[PDB]
Amino acid sequence: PVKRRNAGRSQKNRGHTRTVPCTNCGRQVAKDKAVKRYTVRDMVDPSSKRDIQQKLAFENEKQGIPKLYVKLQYCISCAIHSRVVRVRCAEDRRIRRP
Amino acid sequence: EVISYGPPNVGANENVFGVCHIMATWNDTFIHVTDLSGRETLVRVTGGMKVKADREESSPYAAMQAAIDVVNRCKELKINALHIKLRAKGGVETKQPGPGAQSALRALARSGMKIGRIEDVTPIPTDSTRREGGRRGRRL
Amino acid sequence: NTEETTKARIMDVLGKTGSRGGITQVRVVLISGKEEGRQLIRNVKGACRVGDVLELMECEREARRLR
Amino acid sequence: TQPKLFGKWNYDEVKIQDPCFQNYIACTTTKSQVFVPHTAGRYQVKKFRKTQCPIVERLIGTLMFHGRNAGKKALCIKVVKNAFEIIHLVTGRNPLEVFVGAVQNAGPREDSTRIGTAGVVRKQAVDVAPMRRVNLAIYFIIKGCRESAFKSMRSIAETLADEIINAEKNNTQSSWAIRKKDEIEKVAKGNR
Amino acid sequence: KKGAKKRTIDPLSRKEWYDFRAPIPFSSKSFGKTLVTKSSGNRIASEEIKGRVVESTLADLKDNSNDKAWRKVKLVIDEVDGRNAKTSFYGLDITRDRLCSMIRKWQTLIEARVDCKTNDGYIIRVFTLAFTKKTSAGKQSSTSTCYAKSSQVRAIRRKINTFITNEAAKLGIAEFSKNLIGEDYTKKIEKETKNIFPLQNITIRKVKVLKRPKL
Ligand SMILES: [Mg+2]
Ligand SMILES: [Mg+2]
Ligand SMILES: [Zn+2]
């Protein structure tokens, strides 16, 4: 029978959508389908920043360390296994942004 | 006494600048220091020069040693401040910094070193070219 | 045998780790010559209360997790 | 008046300089100052009672530990008394101020936790606790005594005596105890 | 003890030092130092460093320079005055902090490429970065759309580039560079643009010296 309405993807008008490589397996996945979560990563762990702030050098505009920018793109296959998105129950499958 | 080579100019209020390039792969880590023009290499310490097992050629430990190893060499170049250009085989590879990344920096700061500006220079492409593996990629 | 044994005491007992379900994670405060005051989150093994004192043979550490 | 140990060993003859061991040892208490190391106490009941145990009672306990041969404190209190006389006749020091030091030295400060993932046996850096540290120290000390003590005319009160001494010295060539104390840290310093 | 090393003949022996300096509107100071290998008859001391290139963050003016420390200026050693490295303009840019910085997923992104002509006998390429601005208090959500009909987009390109080709035809590289780094053009573009569609975070992403005559 049928499991989803969007079958995991958002292709709603067009017949074909660009394919993209998986951040983790390298596998090819259609853009719309594949998981995404472009995150604002930080250069150093918590208590570890303070250590670099005191031994820091250049001016101090209070702008600290540049934060890392990671544009994340997972294919289902590994996205799951990678703790990202856990198999959700029946009616919770339609919930968006919990 | 010692015959340093840093330009003829001291001063506990005169900062010296050295551009430290750091590439952090999931296999190996690099730490480089060079003129702010980057055309004359000074210090070059990689995790490989720091351990025996090829798997550890990355490590947080290898980053400490390769890091502290450079700082010593640097006080001798008479340089105290370092600009950081951080990367990670951007190309068509996990544009994410390795592990021996936050480890290397941390070591430079602790072992004294002053830190100039900090950039991220992982080469992000506009297009792309058929990645590692193909169609399905590393499976297992 | 010339070691840098910086004595540090337990600030807060975080949680338990290592599915070996026996290791303990703890937040420390130092008291030694080198630095002092610096706080670290180290991993113990064995009986430990709040406020004990532990000889760290490597202040450059502090692994961590809480999930 | 002050109740000396075995009738001839002032307790106040020692002090715990390091803060670590201060609460994880017995010399320090008024209640601890005992003539005999036998208290048939009720330690090992709450989850830290062991502390309040007069350090030597602990030694005696850990000492009567080999199966068939052991299980009788009566005797063990002896093997420990003679051993104290013998330690004294060599360094003429308050043998508690010896055994005590040994306890502080023979305890590894670092160990490795075996954390294996799918066949591979990995390890990490772990800092050894105080209670655990003392426990290991004594367990270790005694552990060794039996080592040589076996088919030897050398007696436990002698083996043990000879041990508690070097164990205080850190003599890495004369203390099966401190050997591990070092190795455990070394190997551990490798896995870390 | 038995060491594992011992210093015998440093490699950085035959090394001469120099100072980074570029007039234009940047401080007289000698920010940072370079390094080179002594002369050797064939090798000419201060003469290999000709096509040298330095990337510098704005700390090339003492004032409000520490603030605007994201414009990566690239300079070429153009001449050397004994122990000093003189430099002219080569390139102008930005960094990941800023670039990835202004990038939200509910607005539009515009880019304008331009080939300018300066009376100095200099050819440039200037990249512009434009972003659409909201105007309704609604913090850009999945519900807020700040897109700008592709017709309006190019409408701006056409306008932006056209403004800059005229701006260059009337300036000296010394003036242009000075202006490019300054919020002068941010305001001007903002003026022509609010006519087509109100923008935000406007920037001159990058500038490349295409062909610089050496009259
Ligand atoms: Mg189709
Ligand atoms: Mg709208
Ligand atoms: Zn995958």
- For strands B17-23 and B81-87, give the pairing: parallel
Alpha-carbon separation of residue E202 from C15, D5, E37, E110, E111 (angstroms): 49, 85, 43, 10, 10
What single-letter DSSP state applies at residue E205? E
A and B: number of Cβ contacts within 8 A = 74
Residue C44 has its nearest CB partner, among D48, D114, D127, at D127
CA atoms within 13 A on the CB side of B45: 22
Query: No. of H helices and E strands in chain A?
Result: 2, 6
Please report the residues numbered 4 through 43 in chain A whose beta carbons come closer than 8 angstroms to any beta carbon of chain E.
none
In angstroms, rounded to a whole number, what is the distance separating the alpha carbons of residues B34 and B19? Answer: 5
Identify the bridge partners of residue E34 per DSSP, sorted by sequence position.
E18
Contact C21, D94 (CB under 8 A): no
Taking the CA of A16 as reference, the closest ligand is 1
Give strand pairing partners of B119: B85
- Please tell me what resolution, in angstroms, this structure has: 3.9
Nearest to B131 among A21, A52, A71 (CB): A21
Which chains would you list as touching A if contact means 3+ CB atom pairs under 8 Å? B, C, E
Asked if E20 contacts E87 with a C-beta cutoff of 8 angstroms, the reply is yes
Sign of CA dihedral A35, A40, A42, A45: negative
Buried b (16+ CB within 10 A) or exposed e, B34-64: bbbbbbeebbebbbbebbeeeeebbbbebbb
Which chain B residues are closer than 8 Å to A66 by Cβ? 118-120
Report whether B124 contacts B93 (CB < 8 A). Answer: no
Inter-residue contact D102 to D180 (CB < 8 Å)? no
Structure tokens at B107: 């070591």
Residues written for chain D: 192
Q: How many other β-carbons are positioned within 10 Å of the β-carbon of residue A26? A: 22
SS3 per residue for C13-56: EEEEECCCCCEEEEEEEECCCCCCCCEEEEEEECCCCCCCEEEE
Residue E113 near chain B (CB below 8 Å) = no
- C45·D113 Cβ contact <8 A: yes
Residue B60 has which token pair?
């947080």
Q: Residue B23's beta-bridge partner residues?
A: B87
Neighbours, chain C (3 or more CB pairs < 8 A) = A, D
Helix (H, G, I), strand (E, B) or coil at D123: strand
Check: CB of residue C25 under 8 Å from CB of residue C46. no
Q: Do residues A76 and A29 touch, judged by C-beta distance below 8 A?
A: yes
The number of the ligand nearest the C-alpha atom of E141 reads: 2
Greatest alpha-carbon pair distance for chain B in Å reads 63
Which chain A residue has its CA at the smallest distance from E95's CA? A66
Q: Are the beta carbons of B17 and E56 separated by less than 8 Å? A: no
Q: Do B119 and E53 touch (CB under 8 A)?
A: no
Enumerate the residues of chain A whose CB falls inside 8 A of the CB of residue B75: none
Residue of chain C whose alpha carbon sits nearest to that of A50: C38
Cα angle: D64, vertex D67, D69; to 5 degrees: 65
Contact A58 B82 (CB under 8 A): no
How many angstroms separate the CA atoms of B30 and B92, rounded? 19
Q: Within chain B, how many helices (H) and strands (E) appear?
A: 3, 5
Q: How remote is the CA of residue A4 from the centroid of ligand 1, in Å?
A: 18
| Pairing between β-strand E122-132 and β-strand E109-118 as defined by DSSP bridges | antiparallel
Which residues on chain C are in Cβ contact (under 8 Å) with D124?
A: 18, 43, 63
Cα E45 to Cα E31, E51, E52, E84: the distances in Å are 21, 14, 14, 12
Contact yes or no for C24/C43 (Cβ under 8 A): yes
Report yes or no: E59 and A58 within 8 Å, Cβ to Cβ: yes
Contact yes or no for E66 and A61 at CB 8 A: yes
Is residue E12 within 8 A of residue B42, CB to CB? The reply is yes
Q: Strand A35-36 relative to strand E72-80: parallel, antiparallel, unpaired?
A: unpaired
Longest alpha-carbon distance in chain C: 39
Asked if D63 and D84 count as a contact pair (C-beta separation under 8 A), the reply is no
- Residues D36/D42, Cβ–Cβ less than 8 Å: no
Distance from CA of C53 to the nearest CA of D (A): 5
Quick one: which of E133, E150, E125 has its CA closest to E205?
E125
Query: In this complex, does chain B touch chain E, defined as having at least 3 beta-carbon pairs under 8 Å apart?
Result: yes
Distance in Å from the first CA to the final CA of chain C: 39
Residue E155, amino acid: A
- Partners of residue E110 on adjacent β-strands: E130
